[PDB]
């Protein structure tokens, strides 16, 4: 379990989770406030 938590922290795994979370956030901002060119 602690071995698993170490693996889940390895560069690639932490990157997909980080960027997945990022992509979801940016997608939903674009679903709620689409087509923003100003600001």
């Amino acid at each position: 379990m602690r071995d698993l938590k170490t693996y889940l922290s390895v560069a690639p795994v932490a990157s997909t989770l980080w960027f997945a979370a990022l992509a979801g956030l940016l997608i939903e901002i674009n679903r709620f406030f689409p087509d923003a060119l100003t600001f």
Partner: protein, 742 residues
């Protein structure tokens, strides 16, 4: 004594090694000093040789990894069936296959991307697919999304079963070495078992499900009203009304009155004219006969009894005056070197895929496939690339075998030694024939371009000037067309409508196949193919024959399979490694396959594909322009690339615009690859030094010291982006063009 031999609990299942990057390698496991560590971790992940020298422990790794691959394929098929079930117009497509465009992917509405949901028919909006799954499911008698849902669940189950087996056969019950080496048992079980019982059991589905359901579809009855497949098993009279051979049941089979089954087991040939595909009664009779051949062939090699050969006996018995001892010693090599096995299998699997490309276009095996010009151009191209990649892989592991596994003291072989003893005669001969081919193929084009530019079209190699008629191919064509009445009496029509003769088959006003004419232009592009393939073999074969040594580098084998060079001396030794020959052969494989698929696209649009009239006036897509245009390079520039690129460069603003973006994107990645191929890591490492200084100035340098890619990586990165950008460009160019005009 061929028996099941397994070791119990070899490797403990633990996440301990997941937490330790590079555990498999003793060097990598210590951890990174530099960024180069990151890349070697990945480059060495599947190089099971470098992890362990024990052949048993290597075999266990490749065995469970194979289960891993099979798991991935089943999961891949699960999604294909699931999308057909949940996000497709397959049910609507069954009612109108001539018009409705297959679609099995739908994009969510975000950032304007809904435009990729195209008006494909059937009251559906989605991306037009070219994998051809719809023609498969129809030929399988699949009639509803419910049937695809169940196939997707079964595929998902098989994916779990295959993954379980991989963990099981590595951590719980791992076969011993001698179990893997029983090549006689394996060959028997694959011929009779996999190939035989696969073709027989699939023949059963074709008989009891695929034949009857397609007869209702072709008669015109609605799929929602066609009897479910199990009703042709529960009630034989349903079958007997379509094929009265089923009335007598399995009796005519055992009484050798096989001719009684001539209504669902045939030898007609040609294409079902109302569907455009091969006769499903010819196909079912094909799998039947094919299944018989493999079930008996799986009895050739000796196992736990007396009958059968030892494969070693057959090898050790073939040898001539020019060869000496012959195939002696090959059985020890092919039972102790995984790379020798992988080289042969890649060679044949690759070659076989290229054949599948040809046979599937000239003998369309699926209903309404031949007239889906987009699916058929995709299938031929897809399998050419897959085939060409696998072939280049054969040369690498042939080269890897020579560096790592070749040992004349323990596992000698006089055939391999005899070739090594005259590799200079082989490579110099292949060098000259390549120079001959290049001059007498591509040089003729240059002749034509120069003649045509000077206002002298009478001096060209053309059908209307100096003609180079492919007499031998023309002869073979005219032969096969006369086979059904003569040399193949049981055959009604030719095996393919391509066979120069016969007539034509159309589906929905679109031409499926007609006789393909072969003239001067076909002569030229065929000698380009022979030229490009020869140079590909020259580079790759040279790489394996001098993998151990050369007059320039006498101890090359000690430098390994994959190494940048042996320095600037001897005038310069960059790219002497066998690995670098594979690097150079990929570019030439890419070249060769690119003009093969270009040859395919232009010929089909020019002389085959098109629309047929009410009276039979065929209008081909590019109107026969192949004959006078494809004999100069300017003809390919102007009449092929410049003209057919219209669709992709005006795809913006329509559902084909994603091809527009991929067209430009792949150009970008291709140009980006040239940065790696044209430069060298010394420049980059010095650049990074100035950048590292800047980071140090602000206390932001990483402890993992940044390094330029290794010399070999630079080359690997270069060729990878070169192939990806190159091929993706043609992908986006082909699909936009064929979906817009097909």
């Amino acid at each position: 004594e061929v028996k099941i031999l397994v070791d119990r609990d070899p490797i403990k299942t633990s996440f301990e090694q997941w937490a330790k990057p590079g555990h498999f390698s003793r060097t990598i496991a210590k951890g990174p000093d530099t960024t180069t560590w990151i890349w070697n971790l990945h480059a060495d992940a599947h190089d099971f040789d470098s992890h362990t020298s024990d052949l048993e422990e290597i075999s266990r790794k490749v065995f469970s990894a194979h289960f891993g691959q099979l798991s991935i394929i089943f999961l891949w098929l699960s999604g294909m069936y699931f999308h057909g079930a949940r996000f497709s117009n397959y049910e609507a497509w069954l009612n109108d296959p001539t018009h409705i465009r297959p679609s099995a992917q739908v994009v969510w509405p975000i950032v304007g991307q809904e435009i990729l949901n195209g008006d494909v028919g059937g009251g559906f909006r989605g991306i037009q697919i070219t994998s051809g799954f719809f023609q498969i499911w129809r030929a399988s008698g699949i009639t509803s999304e419910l049937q695809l849902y169940c196939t997707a669940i079964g595929a998902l189950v098989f994916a779990a079963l295959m993954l379980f087996a991989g963990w099981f056969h590595y951590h719980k019950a791992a076969p011993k070495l001698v179990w893997f080496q029983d090549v006689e048992s394996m060959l028997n079980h694959h011929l009779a078992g996999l190939l035989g019982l696969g073709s027989l059991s699939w023949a059963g589905h074709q008989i009891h499900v695929s034949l009857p359901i397609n007869q209702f579809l072709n008669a015109g009855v609605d799929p929602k009203e066609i009897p479910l497949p199990h009703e042709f098993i529960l009630n034989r009279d349903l079958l007997a009304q379509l094929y009265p051979s089923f009335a007598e049941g399995a009796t005519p089979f055992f009484t050798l009155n096989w001719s009684k089954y001539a209504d669902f087991l045939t030898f007609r040939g040609g294409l079902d004219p109302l569907t455009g595909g091969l006769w499903l009664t010819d196909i079912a009779h094909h799998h039947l006969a094919i299944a018989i051949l493999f079930l008996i062939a799986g009895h050739m090699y000796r196992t736990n009894w007396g009958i059968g050969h030892g494969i070693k006996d057959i090898l050790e018995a073939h040898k001539g005056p020019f060869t000496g001892q012959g195939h002696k010693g090959l059985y020890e090599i092919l039972t102790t070197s995984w790379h020798a096995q992988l080289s042969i299998n890649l060679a044949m699997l690759g070659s076989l895929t290229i054949i599948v490309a040809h046979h599937m276009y000239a003998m369309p095996p699926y209903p309404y496939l031949a007239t889906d010009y987009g699916t058929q151009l995709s299938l031929f191209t897809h399998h050419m690339w897959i085939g060409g990649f696998l072939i280049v892989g054969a040369a690498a592991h042939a080269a890897i075998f020579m560096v790592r596994d070749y040992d004349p003291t323990t596992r000698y072989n006089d055939l391999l030694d005899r070739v090594l003893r005259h590799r200079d005669a082989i490579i110099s001969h292949l060098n000259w024939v390549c120079i001959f081919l290049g001059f007498h193929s591509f040089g003729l084009y240059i002749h034509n371009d120069t003649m045509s530019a000077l206002g002298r079209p009478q001096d060209m190699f053309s059908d209307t000037a100096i003609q180079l008629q492919p007499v031998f191919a023309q002869w073979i064509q005219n032969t096969h067309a006369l086979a059904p009445g003569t040399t193949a009496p049981g055959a009604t029509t030719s095996t393919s409508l391509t066979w120069g003769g016969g007539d034509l088959v159309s589906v929905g006003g679109k031409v499926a196949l007609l006789p393909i004419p072969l003239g001067t232009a076909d002569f030229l592009v065929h000698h380009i193919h022979a030229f490009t393939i020869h140079v590909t073999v020259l580079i790759l074969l040279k790489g394996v024959l001098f993998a151990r040594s050369s007059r320039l580098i006498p101890d090359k084998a000690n430098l390994g399979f994959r190494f940048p060079c042996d320095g600037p001396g001897r005038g310069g030794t960059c790219q002497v490694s066998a690995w670098d020959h594979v690097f150079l052969g990929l570019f030439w494989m890419y070249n060769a396959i690119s003009v093969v698929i270009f040859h395919f696209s232009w010929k089909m649009q020019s002389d085959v594909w098109g629309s047929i009239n009410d009276q039979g006036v065929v209008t081909h897509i590019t109107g026969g322009n192949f004959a006078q245009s494809s004999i100069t390079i300017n003809g390919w520039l102007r009449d092929f690339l410049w003209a057919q690129a219209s669709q992709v460069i005006q795809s913006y603003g329509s559902s084909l615009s994603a091809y527009g973006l991929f067209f430009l994107g792949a150009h970008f990645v291709w140009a980006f690859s040239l940065m790696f191929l044209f430069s060298g890591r010394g420049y980059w490492q010095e650049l990074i030094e100035s950048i590292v200084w800047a980071h140090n100035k602000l206390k932001v340098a990483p402890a993992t010291q940044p390094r330029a890619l290794s010399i070999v990586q630079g080359r690997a990165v270069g060729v990878t982006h070169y192939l990806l950008g190159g091929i993706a460009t043609t992908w986006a160019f082909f699909l936009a063009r064929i979906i817009a005009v097909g």
